[PDB]
Design a protein around this ligand. Structure first.
Ligand SMILES: [Mg+2]
Ligand SMILES: [Zn+2]
Lengths: 148, 180
């Protein structure tokens, strides 16, 4: 039903894209329903190299366990495939609660750019939680402007 | 811009989902233009991997790769990982400008994880962004539930060339039915 169709939105800041050497500096999480209405805001945590990585994972896993059913909801965000790679490595217990699929807003952007170039031209951060809010607005924009 | 807007479609088959242990056993590549028109079929290679890895695979993996004829084809293969990478890199260098075209497929972020580790030069030819058809699937399921039921079921066994053609058919189905 509607519960399985929720989305687990995240935004992460890393030192870089090298999975073997770079680390997660910042992370935020929030839950939307299938229509992108924000149901609950999770924490915005700055991770050490403020809190430790293992405690941030407990904070985020507790937050999604009380908002989504296990293994059903996908990770959502801007270029969230980059975020998933670091979360599979550094937060594997948090990832055990989610589906393997993602709702990558930048995939939608790559399709908008190609198929609706006029709409792409007029398509619309101090915290990672603010970046999530911006990515939801970008996705809502594609829903209204390029989807049927 | 038209050449930079082409898409590099890939499907991989591996010995499991553990990036620390598992290896690539099959790869296929296909090129479409911006509008999902078929441009060129690339190589379709079965990569030689050890018998220890194959015998120690998951029960899902041993059965599906056994039944499809992939485990047998891997054991008889003379293509190494390095040889397959060279063939795929050569093919995409002939089809797309460097560092501008995205990797495309179903949950292709998982294929990207294996390619970033085992075929880094092939990934360096592609842009940072991906085109994940399973993002569009998940949005179709939610926002266009009627159209979602008309999407064809994936009929292919886990063979790279057939799976990748089905991903193109799926994204073409969404372009045709849920886009404006
Ligand atoms: Mg696949
Ligand atoms: Zn497959």
């Amino acid at each position: 039903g509607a519960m399985a169709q929720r989305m687990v939105w995240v935004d992460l800041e890393m030192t870089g894209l090298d999975i073997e050497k770079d680390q997660i500096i910042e992370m935020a999480c929030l839950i939307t329903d299938s229509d992108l209405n924000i149901l609950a805001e999770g924490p915005n945590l700055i991770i050490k190299q403020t809190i430790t990585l293992q405690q941030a994972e407990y904070e985020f896993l507790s937050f999604v366990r009380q908002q989504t059913p296990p293994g059903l909801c996908p990770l959502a965000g801007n270029s969230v495939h980059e975020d998933k790679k670091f979360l599979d490595k550094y937060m594997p217990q948090f990832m055990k609660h989610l589906h393997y699929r993602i709702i990558d807003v930048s995939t939608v952007k790559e399709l908008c750019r190609r198929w609706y170039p006029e709409e792409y031209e007029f398509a619309p951060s101090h915290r990672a939680l603010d970046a999530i809010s911006e990515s939801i607005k970008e996705l809502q924009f594609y829903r209204n402007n390029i989807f049927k």
